[PDB]
Homo-oligomer: A and B are copies of this chain.
Amino acid sequence: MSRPRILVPGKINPRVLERLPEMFETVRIERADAALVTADMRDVSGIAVSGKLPVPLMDAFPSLEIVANFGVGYDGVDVSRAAARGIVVTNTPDVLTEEVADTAIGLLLNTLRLLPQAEQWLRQGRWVREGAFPLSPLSLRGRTVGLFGLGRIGLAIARRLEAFGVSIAYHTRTPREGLGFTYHPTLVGMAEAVDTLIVIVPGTLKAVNADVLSALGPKGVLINVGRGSTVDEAALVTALQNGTIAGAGLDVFENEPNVPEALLSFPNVSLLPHVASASVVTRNAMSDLVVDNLKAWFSTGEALTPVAETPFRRRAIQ
């Protein structure tokens, strides 16, 4: 049994490790580091990876055909270099869409209604000793929501928001035919028109800058759920400090896991440690898609979810 050999560098969801033996021999190295590649490993034809895949590691495998990335985001893979070598890169879209949309709505409600702070009030004994938690100055009722980015996650968020009875707008570079939402050709224009901005664009130039936050306005609320941040964190802190905007909810940050100290001090801010897809069920589905991409490639010659930059079918082997 000469089964294809798949490298796994460093940590990965254990479900990937569990399922690879269905078709593959797994080659483990402790870190994503070309120094750890031995001569025997040079027949490796696939990689399964979560996070950074340095180019020297990728280029240590002359027979490499496919990189199966864990996550919808694949920033850690040099896709231009992969494309140049005819290497297919796959990601995990679709299976996490609904879970991410759920998290975004949860974060929005927690930011507006202060539910985590209400719970802390109760757990600190203050309901007993001091009385009712103060009324939340904000609410979802009567708000107008602007989506920066659409895609499948944006459509899923928009679908939820319609059912809460809020008006919905969106900004993308091109409008979507068919949708009954208001399209804004510019980000600043949309931020002007709405009081609630939800950032779902993947996110070096931070598009949500001082000008955008100022347009959002004094009743404005910013929600960021990304794979990276396109929010100018220093500009956000300044806006919150000065009352330029009314509140914010953030699941993603410029330099995770580090959150600037100033953001932790505001009473009108909700902070989450990048939990958008972090359920057992959804991370299991992401793991399954990594493995099923590899299985499709080696049993049929085409991947399930290849990225846009690598539209390749499997080549002949001599």
* Residues of chain A at the chain B interface (Cβ within 8 Å): 98-99, 102-103, 105-107, 109-110, 112-113, 115-116, 118-123, 127-128, 131-133, 135-142, 159-160, 162-165, 256-259, 264, 270-275, 278-283
Q: A123-B264, A264-B123, A272-B122 are in contact. Are A115 and B116 (CB under 8 A)?
A: yes
CA distance A116 to B275 in the complex (A): 11
Contacting pair B164 A127 (CB below 8 A): no
Q: A271-B122, A272-B119, A280-B135 are in contact. Are A103 and B99 (CB under 8 A)?
A: no
Shortest CB–CB separation between residue A165 and chain B, in angstroms?
Answer: 6
Contacts of A128 in B (CB 8 A): 257-258
Q: A105-B105, A113-B106, A257-B128 are in contact. Are A139 and B273 (CB under 8 A)?
A: no
Q: Residue A109 contacts which of B105, B136, B140, B280 (CB distance < 8 angstroms)?
A: B105
- With A102-B113, A118-B278, A133-B273 given, name 6 new contacts (CB 8 A): A122-B259, A122-B273, A128-B258, A138-B279, A142-B281, A163-B163
Shortest CB–CB separation between residue A108 and chain B, in angstroms?
Answer: 9
Specify the chain B residue showing the minimal Cβ separation from A270.
B119
Specify the chain B residue showing the minimal Cβ separation from A134.
B278
CA distance A109 to B122 in the complex (A): 18
What are 23 inter-chain pairs, A to B, with CB distance below 8 A?
A98-B141, A102-B164, A103-B109, A105-B109, A106-B109, A115-B272, A116-B120, A118-B272, A118-B273, A118-B278, A122-B272, A122-B273, A128-B257, A133-B273, A135-B279, A135-B283, A136-B278, A139-B279, A139-B282, A159-B163, A160-B164, A162-B163, A163-B163
Contacts of A259 in B (CB 8 A): 122, 127
Contacting pair B272 A139 (CB below 8 A): no
Shortest CB–CB separation between residue A277 and chain B, in angstroms?
Answer: 9
Interface centre among A162, A279, A283 (most CB of B within 10 A): A279
Contacting pair A110 B115 (CB below 8 A): yes
Contacts of A137 in B (CB 8 A): 279-280
